[PDB]
Amino acid sequence: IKVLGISGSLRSGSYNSAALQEAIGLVPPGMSIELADISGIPLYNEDVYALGFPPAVERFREQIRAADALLFATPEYNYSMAGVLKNAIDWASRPPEQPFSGKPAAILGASAGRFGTARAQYHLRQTLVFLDVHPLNKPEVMISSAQNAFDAQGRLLDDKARELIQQQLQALQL
Amino acid sequence: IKVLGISGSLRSGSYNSAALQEAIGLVPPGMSIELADISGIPLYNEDVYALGFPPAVERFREQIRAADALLFATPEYNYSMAGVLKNAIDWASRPPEQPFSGKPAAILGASAGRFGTARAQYHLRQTLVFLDVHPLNKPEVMISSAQNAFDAQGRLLDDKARELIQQQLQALQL
Ligand SMILES: Cc1cc2nc3c(=O)[nH]c(=O)nc-3n(C[C@H](O)[C@H](O)[C@H](O)COP(=O)(O)O)c2cc1C
Ligand SMILES: Cc1cc2nc3c(=O)[nH]c(=O)nc-3n(C[C@H](O)[C@H](O)[C@H](O)COP(=O)(O)O)c2cc1C
Protein backbone atom coordinates (compact mmCIF):
# COMPACT_ATOMS: atom_id res chain seq x y z
CA ILE A 1 0.00 0.00 0.00
CA LYS A 2 1.85 3.04 -1.35
CA VAL A 3 0.90 6.11 0.70
CA LEU A 4 1.87 9.63 -0.37
CA GLY A 5 2.58 12.12 2.39
CA ILE A 6 1.86 15.74 1.64
CA SER A 7 3.02 18.60 3.84
CA GLY A 8 1.52 22.05 3.44
CA SER A 9 4.65 23.71 4.81
CA LEU A 10 7.91 24.44 2.98
CA ARG A 11 10.13 25.39 5.95
CA SER A 12 12.83 22.88 6.84
CA GLY A 13 11.76 22.70 10.49
CA SER A 14 8.07 22.40 9.59
CA TYR A 15 6.27 20.50 12.35
CA ASN A 16 3.88 19.23 9.65
CA SER A 17 6.70 17.79 7.57
CA ALA A 18 8.03 16.37 10.83
CA ALA A 19 4.79 14.56 11.66
CA LEU A 20 4.69 12.85 8.27
CA GLN A 21 8.36 12.01 8.79
CA GLU A 22 7.40 10.21 12.01
CA ALA A 23 4.48 8.52 10.29
CA ILE A 24 6.98 6.66 8.13
CA GLY A 25 8.08 4.65 11.17
CA LEU A 26 4.52 4.25 12.43
CA VAL A 27 3.04 2.54 9.38
CA PRO A 28 1.81 -1.03 9.87
CA PRO A 29 3.16 -4.08 8.03
CA GLY A 30 2.29 -3.85 4.33
CA MET A 31 2.06 -0.06 4.16
CA SER A 32 4.82 2.43 3.33
CA ILE A 33 5.01 6.21 3.09
CA GLU A 34 6.85 8.43 0.62
CA LEU A 35 6.80 12.19 1.04
CA ALA A 36 5.87 14.38 -1.93
CA ASP A 37 7.85 17.55 -2.62
CA ILE A 38 5.84 20.58 -3.68
CA SER A 39 8.55 23.23 -3.25
CA GLY A 40 8.99 23.28 -7.01
CA ILE A 41 5.34 24.00 -7.81
CA PRO A 42 4.68 27.64 -8.83
CA LEU A 43 1.77 29.98 -8.14
CA TYR A 44 -1.21 28.98 -10.24
CA ASN A 45 -1.63 30.94 -13.45
CA GLU A 46 -4.18 29.77 -16.02
CA ASP A 47 -2.00 31.20 -18.82
CA VAL A 48 0.93 29.02 -17.79
CA TYR A 49 -1.43 26.07 -17.39
CA ALA A 50 -2.75 26.61 -20.91
CA LEU A 51 0.79 26.13 -22.20
CA GLY A 52 1.16 22.90 -20.26
CA PHE A 53 1.92 21.62 -16.75
CA PRO A 54 5.15 22.83 -15.14
CA PRO A 55 7.67 20.00 -14.71
CA ALA A 56 7.24 20.06 -10.92
CA VAL A 57 3.45 19.78 -11.28
CA GLU A 58 3.60 16.77 -13.61
CA ARG A 59 5.78 14.86 -11.15
CA PHE A 60 3.38 15.63 -8.32
CA ARG A 61 0.24 14.71 -10.26
CA GLU A 62 1.79 11.40 -11.28
CA GLN A 63 2.77 10.66 -7.69
CA ILE A 64 -0.88 11.11 -6.72
CA ARG A 65 -2.20 8.99 -9.59
CA ALA A 66 0.21 6.17 -8.64
CA ALA A 67 -0.12 6.29 -4.82
CA ASP A 68 -2.76 4.01 -3.26
CA ALA A 69 -3.64 6.57 -0.59
CA LEU A 70 -2.87 10.13 0.50
CA LEU A 71 -1.84 11.51 3.87
CA PHE A 72 -2.18 15.28 4.36
CA ALA A 73 -0.39 17.37 6.97
CA THR A 74 -1.99 20.81 6.68
CA PRO A 75 -0.93 23.71 8.90
CA GLU A 76 -3.55 26.29 9.68
CA TYR A 77 -2.83 29.78 8.37
CA ASN A 78 -5.30 32.48 9.49
CA TYR A 79 -8.32 30.25 10.10
CA SER A 80 -7.85 28.13 6.99
CA MET A 81 -5.41 25.82 5.25
CA ALA A 82 -2.04 27.18 4.27
CA GLY A 83 -2.14 28.92 0.91
CA VAL A 84 0.82 26.88 -0.32
CA LEU A 85 -0.93 23.56 0.23
CA LYS A 86 -4.08 24.81 -1.45
CA ASN A 87 -2.13 26.19 -4.38
CA ALA A 88 -0.53 22.81 -4.97
CA ILE A 89 -3.94 21.11 -4.91
CA ASP A 90 -5.20 23.77 -7.33
CA TRP A 91 -2.53 22.93 -9.91
CA ALA A 92 -2.91 19.18 -9.50
CA SER A 93 -6.69 19.38 -9.89
CA ARG A 94 -6.65 20.58 -13.52
CA PRO A 95 -8.05 18.47 -16.39
CA PRO A 96 -7.51 16.00 -17.88
CA GLU A 97 -8.18 13.15 -15.43
CA GLN A 98 -7.04 14.93 -12.26
CA PRO A 99 -5.36 12.11 -10.24
CA PHE A 100 -7.18 12.90 -6.98
CA SER A 101 -10.33 11.19 -8.29
CA GLY A 102 -11.19 8.07 -6.28
CA LYS A 103 -8.16 8.13 -3.98
CA PRO A 104 -8.69 7.54 -0.24
CA ALA A 105 -6.89 9.87 2.16
CA ALA A 106 -6.19 10.67 5.79
CA ILE A 107 -5.83 14.16 7.25
CA LEU A 108 -3.84 15.46 10.19
CA GLY A 109 -2.51 18.90 11.05
CA ALA A 110 0.08 20.58 13.24
CA SER A 111 -0.10 24.04 14.76
CA ALA A 112 1.98 25.78 17.41
CA GLY A 113 -0.52 27.82 19.41
CA ARG A 114 -3.38 26.28 21.34
CA PHE A 115 -5.85 25.62 18.53
CA GLY A 116 -5.21 25.66 14.81
CA THR A 117 -5.76 22.98 12.18
CA ALA A 118 -9.43 22.47 13.08
CA ARG A 119 -10.57 24.95 10.43
CA ALA A 120 -7.84 24.02 7.96
CA GLN A 121 -8.59 20.31 8.31
CA TYR A 122 -12.25 20.92 7.69
CA HIS A 123 -11.63 23.17 4.66
CA LEU A 124 -9.14 20.64 3.33
CA ARG A 125 -11.62 17.83 3.81
CA GLN A 126 -14.33 19.67 1.88
CA THR A 127 -11.92 20.66 -0.86
CA LEU A 128 -10.72 17.08 -1.24
CA VAL A 129 -14.28 15.74 -1.18
CA PHE A 130 -15.06 18.24 -3.93
CA LEU A 131 -12.41 16.46 -6.02
CA ASP A 132 -13.95 13.01 -5.41
CA VAL A 133 -11.48 12.07 -2.70
CA HIS A 134 -12.66 9.68 0.03
CA PRO A 135 -11.04 10.82 3.32
CA LEU A 136 -11.12 8.92 6.61
CA ASN A 137 -13.64 10.43 9.04
CA LYS A 138 -11.76 9.29 12.14
CA PRO A 139 -9.52 9.17 14.02
CA GLU A 140 -8.87 12.90 14.30
CA VAL A 141 -5.22 13.90 14.52
CA MET A 142 -4.11 17.37 15.56
CA ILE A 143 -0.74 18.28 17.00
CA SER A 144 -1.25 21.33 19.15
CA SER A 145 1.59 23.16 20.90
CA ALA A 146 3.86 21.51 18.35
CA GLN A 147 6.85 23.65 19.44
CA ASN A 148 6.87 21.56 22.62
CA ALA A 149 5.63 18.42 20.89
CA PHE A 150 8.91 17.99 19.01
CA ASP A 151 12.64 18.23 19.71
CA ALA A 152 15.52 19.72 17.67
CA GLN A 153 15.90 16.70 15.39
CA GLY A 154 12.16 16.69 14.61
CA ARG A 155 10.95 13.79 16.79
CA LEU A 156 7.41 13.46 18.23
CA LEU A 157 7.36 13.13 22.03
CA ASP A 158 3.66 12.66 22.87
CA ASP A 159 2.77 8.96 23.11
CA LYS A 160 -0.85 9.98 22.51
CA ALA A 161 0.24 11.50 19.20
CA ARG A 162 2.49 8.60 18.22
CA GLU A 163 -0.39 6.25 19.02
CA LEU A 164 -3.00 8.36 17.23
CA ILE A 165 -1.02 8.30 14.01
CA GLN A 166 -0.52 4.53 14.29
CA GLN A 167 -4.29 4.28 14.71
CA GLN A 168 -5.00 6.45 11.67
CA LEU A 169 -2.50 4.54 9.52
CA GLN A 170 -4.31 1.35 10.42
CA ALA A 171 -7.72 2.94 10.02
CA LEU A 172 -6.33 4.00 6.65
CA GLN A 173 -5.12 0.52 5.74
CA LEU A 174 -8.67 -0.76 6.25
CA ILE B 1 -10.88 57.66 0.29
CA LYS B 2 -8.20 55.37 -1.15
CA VAL B 3 -9.37 51.82 -1.94
CA LEU B 4 -7.21 48.74 -2.65
CA GLY B 5 -8.50 46.23 -5.20
CA ILE B 6 -6.98 42.78 -4.83
CA SER B 7 -7.54 40.11 -7.46
CA GLY B 8 -7.04 36.48 -6.60
CA SER B 9 -6.27 35.65 -10.23
CA LEU B 10 -3.03 36.18 -12.12
CA ARG B 11 -4.21 35.38 -15.65
CA SER B 12 -4.39 38.32 -18.08
CA GLY B 13 -8.08 37.90 -18.87
CA SER B 14 -9.05 37.38 -15.22
CA TYR B 15 -12.73 38.18 -14.77
CA ASN B 16 -12.07 39.02 -11.12
CA SER B 17 -9.46 41.50 -12.23
CA ALA B 18 -11.73 42.80 -15.00
CA ALA B 19 -14.51 43.26 -12.47
CA LEU B 20 -12.39 45.44 -10.18
CA GLN B 21 -11.31 47.49 -13.18
CA GLU B 22 -14.95 48.14 -14.00
CA ALA B 23 -15.46 49.26 -10.40
CA ILE B 24 -12.86 51.91 -11.14
CA GLY B 25 -15.13 53.28 -13.84
CA LEU B 26 -17.87 53.25 -11.20
CA VAL B 27 -16.25 55.05 -8.26
CA PRO B 28 -18.29 57.94 -6.91
CA PRO B 29 -16.59 61.24 -6.16
CA GLY B 30 -14.26 61.09 -3.15
CA MET B 31 -13.18 57.52 -3.81
CA SER B 32 -10.45 56.00 -5.95
CA ILE B 33 -9.50 52.38 -6.59
CA GLU B 34 -5.89 51.29 -7.06
CA LEU B 35 -5.09 47.70 -8.03
CA ALA B 36 -2.53 45.88 -5.92
CA ASP B 37 -0.19 43.56 -7.81
CA ILE B 38 0.57 40.25 -6.08
CA SER B 39 2.05 38.44 -9.07
CA GLY B 40 5.49 39.09 -7.63
CA ILE B 41 4.71 37.53 -4.24
CA PRO B 42 6.44 34.15 -3.83
CA LEU B 43 5.10 30.96 -2.31
CA TYR B 44 5.12 31.29 1.46
CA ASN B 45 8.08 29.87 3.32
CA GLU B 46 8.94 30.58 6.96
CA ASP B 47 12.67 30.29 6.24
CA VAL B 48 12.46 33.06 3.61
CA TYR B 49 10.35 35.33 5.79
CA ALA B 50 12.78 34.96 8.68
CA LEU B 51 15.30 36.88 6.56
CA GLY B 52 12.86 39.68 5.73
CA PHE B 53 9.96 40.36 3.39
CA PRO B 54 10.47 39.94 -0.33
CA PRO B 55 10.15 43.34 -2.01
CA ALA B 56 6.82 42.39 -3.65
CA VAL B 57 5.34 41.43 -0.28
CA GLU B 58 6.73 44.62 1.21
CA ARG B 59 5.22 46.75 -1.51
CA PHE B 60 1.97 44.91 -0.91
CA ARG B 61 1.77 45.33 2.88
CA GLU B 62 2.31 49.09 2.59
CA GLN B 63 -0.48 49.52 0.07
CA ILE B 64 -2.79 47.79 2.49
CA ARG B 65 -1.53 49.93 5.39
CA ALA B 66 -2.08 53.10 3.37
CA ALA B 67 -5.49 52.27 1.85
CA ASP B 68 -8.67 53.35 3.68
CA ALA B 69 -10.58 50.28 2.46
CA LEU B 70 -10.09 46.95 0.71
CA LEU B 71 -11.98 45.43 -2.22
CA PHE B 72 -11.42 41.69 -2.79
CA ALA B 73 -12.32 39.85 -5.97
CA THR B 74 -11.67 36.18 -5.27
CA PRO B 75 -12.25 33.35 -7.69
CA GLU B 76 -13.28 30.01 -6.21
CA TYR B 77 -11.13 26.94 -6.85
CA ASN B 78 -12.06 23.52 -5.51
CA TYR B 79 -14.58 24.52 -2.83
CA SER B 80 -12.57 27.40 -1.40
CA MET B 81 -10.70 30.59 -2.29
CA ALA B 82 -7.89 30.64 -4.85
CA GLY B 83 -4.65 29.35 -3.43
CA VAL B 84 -2.82 32.29 -4.95
CA LEU B 85 -4.89 34.87 -3.09
CA LYS B 86 -4.67 32.98 0.19
CA ASN B 87 -0.86 32.91 -0.15
CA ALA B 88 -0.67 36.67 -0.65
CA ILE B 89 -2.84 37.09 2.41
CA ASP B 90 -0.57 34.71 4.31
CA TRP B 91 2.53 36.76 3.41
CA ALA B 92 0.84 40.08 4.15
CA SER B 93 -0.43 38.89 7.55
CA ARG B 94 2.95 38.30 9.22
CA PRO B 95 4.17 40.48 12.13
CA PRO B 96 5.35 43.19 12.76
CA GLU B 97 2.01 44.94 12.56
CA GLN B 98 0.33 43.28 9.59
CA PRO B 99 -1.73 46.01 7.78
CA PHE B 100 -5.07 44.18 7.60
CA SER B 101 -5.88 45.15 11.19
CA GLY B 102 -8.78 47.62 11.36
CA LYS B 103 -9.39 48.06 7.64
CA PRO B 104 -12.98 47.74 6.38
CA ALA B 105 -13.37 45.56 3.31
CA ALA B 106 -15.93 44.32 0.83
CA ILE B 107 -16.02 40.99 -1.03
CA LEU B 108 -17.06 39.97 -4.53
CA GLY B 109 -16.22 36.92 -6.61
CA ALA B 110 -16.17 36.05 -10.28
CA SER B 111 -16.73 32.52 -11.54
CA ALA B 112 -17.78 30.67 -14.66
CA GLY B 113 -20.59 28.14 -14.75
CA ARG B 114 -23.03 26.83 -12.14
CA PHE B 115 -22.30 28.42 -8.74
CA GLY B 116 -19.10 30.03 -7.60
CA THR B 117 -17.27 31.95 -4.94
CA ALA B 118 -19.97 31.36 -2.28
CA ARG B 119 -17.55 29.11 -0.35
CA ALA B 120 -14.46 31.13 -1.18
CA GLN B 121 -16.24 34.29 -0.03
CA TYR B 122 -17.18 32.63 3.24
CA HIS B 123 -13.64 31.39 3.90
CA LEU B 124 -12.21 34.74 2.85
CA ARG B 125 -14.65 36.64 5.07
CA GLN B 126 -13.64 34.38 7.94
CA THR B 127 -9.90 34.61 7.40
CA LEU B 128 -10.14 38.41 7.10
CA VAL B 129 -12.14 38.77 10.33
CA PHE B 130 -9.43 36.65 11.90
CA LEU B 131 -7.01 39.45 10.92
CA ASP B 132 -9.40 42.03 12.33
CA VAL B 133 -10.81 43.28 9.08
CA HIS B 134 -14.37 44.60 9.14
CA PRO B 135 -15.97 43.08 6.05
CA LEU B 136 -19.43 44.18 4.94
CA ASN B 137 -22.14 41.56 5.05
CA LYS B 138 -24.35 43.25 2.48
CA PRO B 139 -24.65 43.19 -0.41
CA GLU B 140 -23.47 39.78 -1.64
CA VAL B 141 -21.72 40.18 -4.98
CA MET B 142 -21.39 37.00 -7.04
CA ILE B 143 -20.76 37.20 -10.78
CA SER B 144 -21.70 33.77 -12.13
CA SER B 145 -21.46 32.55 -15.74
CA ALA B 146 -18.59 35.03 -15.91
CA GLN B 147 -17.50 33.66 -19.30
CA ASN B 148 -20.68 35.22 -20.72
CA ALA B 149 -20.85 38.13 -18.30
CA PHE B 150 -17.72 39.68 -19.79
CA ASP B 151 -16.87 40.40 -23.41
CA ALA B 152 -13.45 40.56 -25.05
CA GLN B 153 -11.13 42.97 -23.25
CA GLY B 154 -13.36 43.73 -20.24
CA ARG B 155 -16.71 45.51 -20.02
CA LEU B 156 -19.26 43.89 -17.75
CA LEU B 157 -22.24 43.20 -20.03
CA ASP B 158 -24.46 42.10 -17.13
CA ASP B 159 -26.40 45.08 -15.77
CA LYS B 160 -27.26 43.15 -12.59
CA ALA B 161 -23.66 42.84 -11.40
CA ARG B 162 -23.22 46.53 -12.22
CA GLU B 163 -25.86 47.59 -9.70
CA LEU B 164 -24.21 45.52 -7.00
CA ILE B 165 -20.74 46.96 -7.58
CA GLN B 166 -22.26 50.46 -7.40
CA GLN B 167 -24.18 49.59 -4.23
CA GLN B 168 -21.13 47.90 -2.76
CA LEU B 169 -18.98 50.94 -3.51
CA GLN B 170 -21.58 53.26 -1.98
CA ALA B 171 -21.96 51.18 1.18
CA LEU B 172 -18.17 51.02 1.45
CA GLN B 173 -17.90 54.80 1.29
CA LEU B 174 -20.31 54.98 4.26
C1 LIG C 1 0.65 33.25 7.61
C2 LIG C 1 0.55 32.41 8.88
C3 LIG C 1 -0.79 32.23 9.45
C4 LIG C 1 -0.92 31.43 10.66
N1 LIG C 1 -2.15 31.22 11.23
C5 LIG C 1 -2.51 30.52 12.33
C6 LIG C 1 -3.81 30.38 12.78
O1 LIG C 1 -4.79 30.87 12.25
N2 LIG C 1 -3.95 29.59 13.95
C7 LIG C 1 -2.93 28.96 14.67
O2 LIG C 1 -3.18 28.30 15.66
N3 LIG C 1 -1.65 29.12 14.19
C8 LIG C 1 -1.44 29.87 13.07
N4 LIG C 1 -0.14 30.08 12.49
C9 LIG C 1 1.09 29.46 13.16
C10 LIG C 1 1.46 28.05 12.66
O3 LIG C 1 0.46 27.10 12.99
C11 LIG C 1 2.76 27.62 13.32
O4 LIG C 1 3.78 28.59 13.01
C12 LIG C 1 3.19 26.19 12.86
O5 LIG C 1 4.37 25.79 13.58
C13 LIG C 1 3.63 26.05 11.44
O6 LIG C 1 4.01 24.71 11.23
P1 LIG C 1 4.56 24.17 9.88
O7 LIG C 1 5.82 24.90 9.71
O8 LIG C 1 4.81 22.76 10.13
O9 LIG C 1 3.57 24.49 8.84
C14 LIG C 1 0.18 30.83 11.32
C15 LIG C 1 1.51 31.02 10.74
C16 LIG C 1 1.72 31.79 9.54
C17 LIG C 1 3.19 31.90 9.03
C1 LIG D 1 -8.68 24.79 -9.51
C2 LIG D 1 -9.83 25.35 -10.34
C3 LIG D 1 -11.17 24.80 -10.08
C4 LIG D 1 -12.29 25.31 -10.87
N1 LIG D 1 -13.57 24.81 -10.67
C5 LIG D 1 -14.76 25.11 -11.28
C6 LIG D 1 -15.99 24.51 -10.99
O1 LIG D 1 -16.18 23.65 -10.15
N2 LIG D 1 -17.09 24.99 -11.76
C7 LIG D 1 -17.05 25.97 -12.77
O2 LIG D 1 -18.06 26.29 -13.36
N3 LIG D 1 -15.82 26.53 -13.03
C8 LIG D 1 -14.70 26.13 -12.32
N4 LIG D 1 -13.36 26.68 -12.54
C9 LIG D 1 -13.24 27.76 -13.64
C10 LIG D 1 -13.16 29.24 -13.17
O3 LIG D 1 -14.29 29.62 -12.38
C11 LIG D 1 -13.05 30.14 -14.42
O4 LIG D 1 -11.93 29.77 -15.23
C12 LIG D 1 -12.98 31.67 -14.04
O5 LIG D 1 -13.22 32.45 -15.22
C13 LIG D 1 -11.66 32.18 -13.58
O6 LIG D 1 -11.77 33.56 -13.32
P1 LIG D 1 -10.58 34.43 -12.82
O7 LIG D 1 -9.62 34.38 -13.93
O8 LIG D 1 -11.11 35.78 -12.68
O9 LIG D 1 -10.08 33.77 -11.60
C14 LIG D 1 -12.15 26.31 -11.87
C15 LIG D 1 -10.81 26.86 -12.12
C16 LIG D 1 -9.65 26.40 -11.38
C17 LIG D 1 -8.29 27.06 -11.76
Side-chain angles (χ1 to χ4, degrees), chain B residues 22-37:
Chain B
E22 286 294 277
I24 296 178
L26 294 173
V27 281
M31 177 189 278
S32 53
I33 295 175
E34 201 213 319
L35 306 178
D37 185 353

Side-chain angles (χ1 to χ4, degrees), chain A residues 44 46 90 93-94 130, chain B residues 9 11 14-16 75-78 110-114:
Chain A
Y44 189 79
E46 192 69 35
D90 285 342
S93 56
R94 305 305 291 143
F130 175 84
Chain B
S9 177
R11 82 190 185 76
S14 180
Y15 297 142
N16 277 282
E76 173 171 310
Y77 302 164
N78 309 309
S111 63
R114 202 72 199 71

Side-chain angles (χ1 to χ4, degrees), chain A residues 9 11 14-17 75-79 110-116, chain B residues 44 46 90-91 93-94 130:
Chain A
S9 173
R11 79 193 197 74
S14 172
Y15 300 133
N16 282 281
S17 306
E76 182 156 306
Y77 279 9
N78 302 312
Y79 263 18
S111 48
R114 287 159 293 160
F115 210 75
Chain B
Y44 189 79
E46 195 65 35
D90 290 334
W91 263 114
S93 77
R94 304 298 288 154
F130 176 79

